[PDB]
């Protein structure tokens, strides 16, 4: 059940420990972005932030006030705004961040907020006992794009690397590695055959079919461009 927690942010529960939110932002489009909120021992991990500090603040305050958990952790999918737009506020709030080194480096050269701990292959952050496993399986939608697996929950936040079942466009391929994209998706499917829920960057979530679907979109793109 979708729960509007603001006129722009709405949250939806997938399990007792996991929630996926959608924040909307006018830009391009009044586009909607997805992210997660993983809770344990009154500790929250925000996975991706809303387009900015304002939205981010609203969400974090809702997690506290409503979910009765304090966001102490943050992991961005990659350096794009719908991933780290609210990192500044979080840092202001004292949040520990982890991200692919690639992301850290890009945000850096981009004068963008910088996640503070950087990993290169894979990493597991124990959200007070709860494992949040991050993996860099290759380039996709963005060169630095990662996925975060919640083993205990069997939930994959594949991020902006996966498209919802209704999607039909490859999207912004400005920072994408098109040719790598299909192989990454291959590694992802193979790596999480147990995905109960697969959550993408924009749109509704589903199951592992989101992987094969995104891969259909990309391969077709690669063919359209004979």
Binding-site residues, please? 78, 80, 82, 141, 160, 163, 172, 202
**Interface region with Hg ion, contact rule CB under 5 A, candidates 10-18, 82-90, 147-155, 165-173:** 82-90
- Our finding on whether 217 is near Zn ion (CB under 5 A) is no
- Our finding on whether 170 is near Zn ion (CB under 5 A) is no
* Closest CA relative to residue 198, chosen from 51, 36, 24, 81: 36
- Our finding on whether 160 is near Hg ion (CB under 5 A) is yes
Question: Catalytic residue positions?
Answer: 78, 80, 82, 141, 160, 163, 172, 202
Q: Which residue is nearest to Zn ion (CB)?
A: 80
Considering only residues 58 through 87, tell me which ones interact with Zn ion, judged by CB under 5 A.
80
Least separation, in Å, of the C-beta of 81 and Zn ion? 8
- Our finding on whether 217 is near Hg ion (CB under 5 A) is no
- Our finding on whether 55 is near Hg ion (CB under 5 A) is no
Least separation, in Å, of the C-beta of 78 and Hg ion? 6
- Our finding on whether 83 is near Hg ion (CB under 5 A) is yes
Residues forming the site for Zn ion (CB under 5 A): 80, 160
């Amino acid at each position: 059940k979708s729960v509007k927690i603001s006129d722009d942010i709405s949250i939806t529960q997938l399990s007792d420990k996991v929630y996926t939110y959608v924040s909307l932002a006018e830009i391009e489009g009044m586009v909607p972005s997805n992210g997660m909120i993983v809770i344990n021992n009154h500790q929250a991990a925000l996975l991706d932030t809303p387009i900015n500090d304002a939205q981010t603040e609203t969400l974090v305050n809702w997690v506290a006030d409503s979910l009765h958990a304090k966001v102490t952790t943050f992991i961005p999918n990659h350096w794009h705004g719908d991933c780290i737009g609210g990192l500044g506020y979080l840092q202001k709030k004292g949040v520990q961040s982890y991200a692919n080194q690639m992301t850290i480096d890009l945000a850096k050269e981009k004068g963008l907020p910088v996640p503070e701990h950087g990993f290169t292959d894979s990493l597991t952050v124990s959200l007070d006992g709860m494992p949040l496993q991050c993996y860099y399986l290759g380039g996709g939608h963005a060169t630095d794009n990662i996925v975060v697996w919640l083993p205990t929950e069997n939930i994959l936040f594949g991020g902006c690397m996966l498209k919802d079942n209704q999607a039909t466009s490859i999207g912004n391929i400005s920072d994408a590695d098109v040719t790598a994209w299909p192989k990454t998706l291959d590694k992802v499917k193979a790596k999480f055959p147990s995905a109960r829920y697969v959550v993408p960057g924009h749109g509704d979530y589903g199951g592992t079919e989101l992987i094969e679907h995104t891969k259909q979109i990309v391969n077709q793109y690669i063919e359209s461009t004979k």
